[model samples]
Target: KLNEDISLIEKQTSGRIGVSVWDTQTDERWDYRGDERFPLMSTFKTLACATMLSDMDSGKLNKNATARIDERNIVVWSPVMDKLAGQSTRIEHACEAAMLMSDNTAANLVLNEIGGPKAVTLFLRSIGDKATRLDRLEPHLNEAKPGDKRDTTTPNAMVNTLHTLMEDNALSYESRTQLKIWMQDNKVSDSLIRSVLPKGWSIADRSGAGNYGSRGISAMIWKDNYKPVYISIYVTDTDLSLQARDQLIAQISQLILEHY
Candidate 1:
């Protein structure tokens, strides 16, 4: 069922796309070009949050620790945290802004507070997700150079990362719960997985968009009489417009949800 759905999307769309889905309660799974690498726009923020949560769980960091955001870290696309510049706020607040709003400046603040991009990559390696790496900080989208590296991930790698969060093994229970809360309340644009889901179904997801395209990782927990689902979908290097690309993701996500 999933294979046919994915094939239909690929056949009908004109772009580089990848998808992976898994049943959290069962062994059923499927993938289409899931191993291919794609630039993870803001979805990389999920990994940044994971790194911070791991540190807080291990006593290396404190969730309540305060960081003052000033003019230095402010960048484009920062709606929530940019206004708070020069004011002290908890690390947790910045994390919430990053997850909920996909605020670039907020993400950079969190990344800087918890080591840096290297620390996020190290955390990914430690968790057995070898291909997923946070190579650069937020705001690199506009400042990026021709040869400079950018954050990247595979569909399978992202799904695995989402699975790790659901299983509650890689992070302490408190950390995992906090992450889920932020993702659940995310107010980012409705153009991906959640866009097609039926009402009453809640999804914890992180979505990213940029010049390349849009991508997302979502863990769907239906209200009743539905098995939990985990899916990661990414599209890049597409001739399609941004709206078209997003619609493709929504169409594919809806199909996946209906099947599971």
Candidate 2:
């Protein structure tokens, strides 16, 4: 079973892992520690982006509305916002910037538009998820503090939200398609899943990294003539190098793909 195989992989790292895989094509599930909470890191960018889409769909937010890229709001790892600063653009572009580049500043902008951290959690609740919550913005949101629930989500919770936003018709058809493109085209991913995916299959994923070697990812995977595979994985409480952590994730992903 995957749980046993991955338990061996867990011994190789000084961390706890939470993994959830839902193969809708077969209506099967494989999980390990999927109920525990883990830090979200940049992986929440996808959820933040999805919240923005919900606003746009409900007429609460206008896709064409623009905001100045105030230098005051730019934070670390904001390549897109930094470059776009000294100018202004449609607010929706911030969502693109957040997903495509994991831009921290751009994410703040989108968060402000969607009414902040609690709003995203509320959006999740409205979509049938109660366990996943976002409590802060950018850097703080990635705190990854052990035993702290400020900004953590269970692996099962992530897949539920991802399934809703990406596959369960929660978002408007166009909005869902656009979100996938942004994630599919993301640039700063761990890509453990992508690395192990068989040839011709594809994944639209978002990655996150934080303190204590915490890493997270949730993705929609598919190939020609198939229903999508939804997966979410999180690792925490480790003291390992980024390379080792990524490889660990890749190994887990391979095990999941083989059976599903």
Candidate 3:
């Protein structure tokens, strides 16, 4: 079962891949293919969201809390938020929109409001996601210079932070529930986490893509009854087609749902 799934993936991706399954509930893990480090596009959101929620649980931050958008909010433009909600979204809405729709403004606002990309990166490391980095929010252009802190990550680390948020009781129960809810509303259409689930099972996850510009997709999934699994699938520097990318994710999702 595992080999067939792995082979199908290898054939479709033209081969840039990493597949690691972590049983979040019990701590058992299986790596079926490639290296652990693959460029994480917006998968970083999982970490950023968790960090902020942790702070909120500590009474340091609040997702439902509102914050006025600023004229200088670091966002560029995406399908996520007010092309001109024009700095009017509440912090909670921004949190949802940011993760669900991959809202540009919302993410920038959260990144800045929560303490800049560096601060978020620091928190991830503090919690042991040392392989992760803030680098910058998606769109990739934000990270063009050597001086730019923007960068990438491995599936192991990306999924690790998410696992922490879901299983470790690091954040308050309410906060984790909220974050997971937003994840279930995944904005990035190209995702392994959501594409792979059985109809009735609840899946809370996140995906990041740069299909046109940078070219990659990363997703993390948590379902009821079967422990959580972190599946990071990527296709880098291709000639620019999202078909293969999307299919790969769907394939992985189907595998886990039907078998595990």
Candidate 4:
């Protein structure tokens, strides 16, 4: 019933779709094409920033540590890049900007402070995920050509990663709660998973977009007096309007919420 229910929604897009869900209270997990790779794009920034916080926890990098931004660091969609030029900002500030604003410049700044993409991949490995990997910076990272494995993650890998970040000991109580607050109020998430969420339920998520209408959302949902649940969805190859792609995820989320 769930697969067909998802299929009916997938039918609405001229794209490939992948979804994964974990009902924490029930320990129930579900997937559809969840192993297929999809470019992570900005979503990986969530993990990248968390890695920065992990460094903070270990004292390798302090939250007060600063990253100096130069003109070359700026990229499209970067709100802080221009203002930060030849100036330094706190590592924690850049980390929040990367998530709250999807600032490519801030994202690369966070990545640089964390020792680039390999460190992030190793961070994933250390946190118990083998399927998600980061290979490049933004702009280049968003080039999700068919079948390319670089800078990609499966839905299962993504949701699992978010679950670990939000609920497990991968981060300390302070870092985990901090990361969740950033994701909960993310600037780019208003239209994806949270667009159609029902009343009384709240969402904390990171979303990504790439070439070919590729879009994704990885999130944890909450309700007072109820267990939190994790869900992730990805869309690729759609040739229609971007809104159509978003609606696909919106409806999928609404579907998942209905049964969970």
Q: Per-model C-alpha lDDT, please?
A: 0.77, 0.86, 0.63, 0.87
Q: Residues 92-182, candidate 1, lDDT per residue (tens digit)?
A: 8888899999888888888888889889889989888889767677667422222334677888888888888768499988888898888
List where candidate 3 sits over 4 angstroms from the true fold: 1-15, 24-27, 32-35, 62-66, 70-77, 83-86, 141-150, 190-193, 211-224, 256-258
lDDT of 2 at 120: 89
> Model 3, range 216-254, lDDT digits (tens) per residue?
444455545655665555444444356556666677656
Model 1: runs farther than 4 Å from truth? Answer: 11-14, 141-149, 224-227
Q: Over all chains combined, what TM-score does candidate 2 have?
A: 0.96
How many Å off is the CA of 166 in candidate 3? 0.8
1 versus 3: better TM-score goes to: 1
Clashes of each: 0, 0, 7, 0
Q: In model 4, where is the ten-residue run with the lowest total lDDT?
A: 237-246
**Over the full model, what C-alpha lDDT does candidate 2 score relative to the true structure?**
0.86
Candidates in order, TM-scores: namely 0.90, 0.96, 0.79, 0.96
Residue 242 of model 3, lDDT score: 61
**Could you say which candidate leads in lDDT?**
4
Overall local distance difference test of candidate 1: 0.77
